[PDB]
Amino acid sequence: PKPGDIFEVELAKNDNSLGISVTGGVNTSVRHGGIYVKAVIPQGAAESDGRIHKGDRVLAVNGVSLEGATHKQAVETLRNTGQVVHLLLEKGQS
Amino acid sequence: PKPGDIFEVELAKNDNSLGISVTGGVNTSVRHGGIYVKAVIPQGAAESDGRIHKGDRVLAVNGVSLEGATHKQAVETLRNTGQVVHLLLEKGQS
Amino acid sequence: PKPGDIFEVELAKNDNSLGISVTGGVNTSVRHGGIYVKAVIPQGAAESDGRIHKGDRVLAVNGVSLEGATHKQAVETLRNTGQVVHLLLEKGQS
Amino acid sequence: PKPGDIFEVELAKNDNSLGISVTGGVNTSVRHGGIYVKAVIPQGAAESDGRIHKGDRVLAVNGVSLEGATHKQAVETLRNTGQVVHLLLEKGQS
Amino acid sequence: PKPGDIFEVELAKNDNSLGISVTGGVNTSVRHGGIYVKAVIPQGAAESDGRIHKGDRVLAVNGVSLEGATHKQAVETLRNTGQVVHLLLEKGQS
Amino acid sequence: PKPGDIFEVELAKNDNSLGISVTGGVNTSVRHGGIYVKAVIPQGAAESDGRIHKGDRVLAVNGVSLEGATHKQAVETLRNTGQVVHLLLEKGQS
């Protein structure tokens, strides 16, 4: 994808983690309060898969929008998932 | 989804089980012979994922309709899959 | 698709009709009480498209299951759509 | 869909209009700057289709995110499309 | 999409044309015997839609691969469709 | 699917393998340089899943076309993936 493009992934966890950290939330001044990929963890699931990078916006998890989520809630939403997770993203770096 | 809506999931097994029991089949008097989720097994894959609930109808597995399946046939169709399974469902009533 | 396979189409109406007649519904003795394609109307939209054939089962319209529909209800659901309609189907026999 | 659910539509224009008006954008004082459906025009494309309503958020158009878009920019993004437009939404009216 | 990316479009015809011309086929010496977009016709459907460009590869039409098609067969496959057509493409080089 | 149909799968690895061996690539004399399933490994991931068979063509991996791939490039593309891999295929003859 190009920056700005929507894309979706079915991401399998490794070590029961998606291998990303997130930044943002409505409680934050992070732009518009969105949830963004802060970092892909070395040798983690996201990195091995290769489609998600720092800067991508996480729009939804398993069919549910993250709109209105505080940081705590976004993290919890990502954790409260099974071994394969459906993620909807916008490609960052535009 | 709301009751009646179509949804799809890619569900990873836990210890080779999707963690759902089903009821129904053409051989039964259940509704019109359809395959429905009887229970989401505690601690299982379907429960962790959080999208599938008791009463949802399973319409297809890995791209093949369950039409005409007996109960036994549906159970075996669900078992005879790999580690991640594509499921097409209709959301049940609350 | 082969018989039994799930497929979907986005079908544009010709002169406000999808060009399919249906058979079945829970008030009939058509198998499983399902809604099936009775005919692909000559010169109509479904015929021109080429993917839908007599005997295919219509599972959903614009994201909403036809589960439990009477014949009349199914016909209305098809008719109460805009110009392009999303249809979910099961490929029929022979 | 339930409020908060992601959904997508392929919507055909009527009289070269999708038959919805929008509110919001980065510059505006509305809802985190996101783009929301303000109204569905009577007899219009979106109304006939029946899947989009006031309050839904428009996440993307033809594969491209509306993220960071101003009002004018969003309104034009919607206009510079062809006869059928792919829309990604979040169901509103919690 | 970036060059090499898969993308899909539901394209409504304008004046009964998709507004694209193609090059290639197993009877030509075009690379891989593939079918490529030769031109997008000014003011046509593809151009208004904005997602398809010269050099993109057409992988499939309405669910069917163009693998092994001669040039005339590819053209006919494109023509022998309804008012809205599902196209699977690979993004070409710019 | 029928021969020539497009299908997609989300395939989970078993013991870090997709359970398929492929043949072809631009450097080979196989077909028109495409990447094809040579075998599915007994008791492996692809076999258990049941949708991919010898002769199917792999068109893309995780959203990126295998156009122009040498064999070694194709294999590396398959390997440089996470635990669940999105594959786009054309159903082979028979």
Description:
Chains A, B, C, D, E, F: Residues 8-92 form the PDZ domain. Chains A, B, C, D, E, F: Tyrosine phosphatase which negatively regulates FAS-induced apoptosis and NGFR-mediated pro-apoptotic signaling. May regulate phosphoinositide 3-kinase (PI3K) signaling through dephosphorylation of PIK3R2. The structure is a homohexamer of 94-residue chains. With 94 residues, chain A is α+β, with helices and mostly antiparallel strands. Helices cover 15% and strands 34% of the residues of chain A. The first copy, chain A, has one domain: Pdz3 Domain (Roll), CATH 2.30.42.10. The first copy, chain A, has helices at residues 45-49, 71-79, and strands at 6-12, 20-24, 35-40, 57-61, 64-65, 84-90. The longest helix of chain A is centred in the C-terminal third of the chain and has 9 residues, at 71-79. The interface between A and D is medium-sized, with 18 and 17 residues.
Give the overall shape of chain A.
globular
What is the total number of structural domains of chain A? 1
The secondary structure category of chain A is alpha+beta
Q: Sketch the major β-sheet of chain A.
A: 4 strands, antiparallel
Oligomer, anyone? homohexamer
User: Percent of residues of chain A in beta strands?
Assistant: 25-35%
Total DSSP E strands of chain A? 6
Assigned CATH class of chain A: Mainly Beta
Q: What is the largest interface, and how many residues per chain?
A: A-D, 18 and 17 residues
Q: What's the alpha carbon Rg of chain A, rounded to whole Å?
A: 12 Å
CATH superfamily of chain A: PDZ domain
Order of helices and strands of chain A: EEEHEEHE
Strand arrangement across the biggest beta sheet of chain A: 1-6-4-5
- Assigned CATH architecture of chain A: Roll
Give the end-to-end Cα distance of chain A, rounded to a whole number of Å. Answer: 11 Å
Helix count from the secondary structure assignment of chain A:
2
Task: Find the CATH topology of chain A.
Answer: Pdz3 Domain
Helix content of chain A: 10-25%
